[PDB]
Amino acid sequence: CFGVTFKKPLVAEEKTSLEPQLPHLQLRLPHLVGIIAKIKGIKIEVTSSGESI
Amino acid sequence: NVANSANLSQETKALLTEMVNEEMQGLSDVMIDFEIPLGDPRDQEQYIH
Numbered sequence: 001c002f003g004v005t006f007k008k009p010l011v012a013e014e015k016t017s018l019e020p021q022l023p024h025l026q027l028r029l030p031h032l033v034g035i036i037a038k039i040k041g042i043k044i045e046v047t048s049s050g051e052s053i
Numbered sequence: 054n055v056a057n058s059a060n061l062s063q064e065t066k067a068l069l070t071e072m073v074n075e076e077m078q079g080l081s082d083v084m085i086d087f088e089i090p091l092g093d094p095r096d097q098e099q100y101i102h
C-alpha cells in the first residue's frame with residue numbers, strides 16, 4: 001500500500017522444552033552383578049578321607 | 054527428562070533435584086513476578102476475570 005509493504009504477523013510457539021545432550025562415559029564395571037553372584041556360589045566339595053576306610 | 058535420559062538410580066536423582074532447586078531459587082530471588090499487559094485499559098471484563 002503506497003510505497004510501504006506490509007507483512008503478516010508471526011505466530012509464536014507457546015512453550016519450549018529443554019533436553020540437553022549428556023556425555024556417555026560407558027563404564028563397564030557397573031551392571032556386572034552377575035559375576036559377583038557367581039563368585040558367591042563357589043561351592044567347594046571336600047569328602048572326609050578315612051571315614052570310609 | 055534429564056533423569057530419564059541419564060540413568061540415575063534413585064540416589065543421584067536427589068543430588069540433581071537439589072542443584073536444580075537451589076539454582077532456580079537463586080534466580081527467583083531477584084524477579085518481581087508481575088503480569089504482561091495485553092489488551093485495553095478501559096475493559097472491565099478482563100480485570101473482573
Ligand SMILES: *[C@@H]1O[C@H](CO)[C@@H](O[C@@H]2O[C@H](CO)[C@@H](O)[C@H](O)[C@H]2NC(C)=O)[C@H](O)[C@H]1NC(C)=O
Binds near residue numbers: 022023058
Ligand atoms: C543410559 O542407559 C541407556 C541404556 O543402556 C543408554 O542408551 C544406550 O546408548 C548406547 C550409546 O549411544 C546405544 O548404543 C544403545 O542403543 C542405547 N540403548 C538404549 C536402550 O537406548 C544411555 O546411553 C545411557 N545414558 C548415559 C548418559 O550414559
